[PDB]
């Protein structure tokens, strides 16, 4: 069970970035994929999650209108598209599989495992 991502991107401000996350070792369409962002020197910041079966997505109420998440079940890869880039958007972007803790008929918490290697996106002129 592992998650492999793309490489670094030196995008310019006012552009768009797409980061890929390929799943190997498990059924891609059976678990959620979460995107976490870590600014250089600061802590992790949850961006959103995507359902790999029905295509549903749930963002945070800070990235609405700037992040669109898509999936590709044929090649088992989930994409994150981030628009209206800014200088503060430079960070390491992580893709993580979310495991829900199902206690029979109800779910209670969970964790993120595995995590991808992270892609460093830099925004500069």
């Amino acid at each position: 069970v592992q998650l492999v991502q793309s490489g670094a991107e030196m995008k310019k401000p006012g552009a768009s970035v797409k980061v890929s996350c390929k799943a190997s070792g498990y059924t891609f369409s059976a678990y959620y994929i979460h995107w976490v962002r870590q600014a250089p020197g600061q802590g992790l910041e949850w961006m959103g999650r995507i359902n790999t079966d029905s295509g549903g997505t749930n963002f945070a109420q800070q990235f609405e209108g700037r992040v669109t998440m898509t999936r590709d079940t044929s090649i088992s890869t989930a994409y994150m598209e981030l628009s209206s880039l800014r200088s503060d958007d430079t960070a390491v972007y992580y893709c993580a599989r979310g495991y829900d803790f199902w206690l029979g008929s109800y779910r209670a918490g969970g964790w993120f495992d595995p995590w991808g290697q992270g892609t460093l996106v830099t925004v500069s002129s």
Partner: protein
Amino acid sequence: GFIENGWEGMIDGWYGFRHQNSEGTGQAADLKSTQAAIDQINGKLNRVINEKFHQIEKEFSEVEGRIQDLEKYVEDTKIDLWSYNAELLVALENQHTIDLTDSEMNKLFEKTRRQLRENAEDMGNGCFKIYHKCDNACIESIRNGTYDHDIYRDEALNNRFQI
């Protein structure tokens, strides 16, 4: 079948427990039942896993007749019978393996139920509801077989029947 789905997150055993209480959730595996299943499966494997030196000729380059046809018929009969035997054996052994694994799961469920006594009630999804405060030491006691039900019986009965 009353347990619907398996757990891909428990990789330290075949059968285990999952719990929720005031101090959180957790997961632990059962060694005795997993070991019993593995020993039965390996004992069945060992029974499945002849020394022939000189036999009849099985490939022929000339057309002869009666004797060659008898040899071919004998070999074909032997291969067909052994192929059928192999198919029957594998079908039977697979069926037995599946049945015994389900039986082991049911045995663990019934053992936990008989441990809990009147202090808990089955929810129907293959997994229980306990009617008293049960910390991690409590779950540990249920798991390792040292769960005393008389010291929780009063409050369990109060919570179960009197609302």
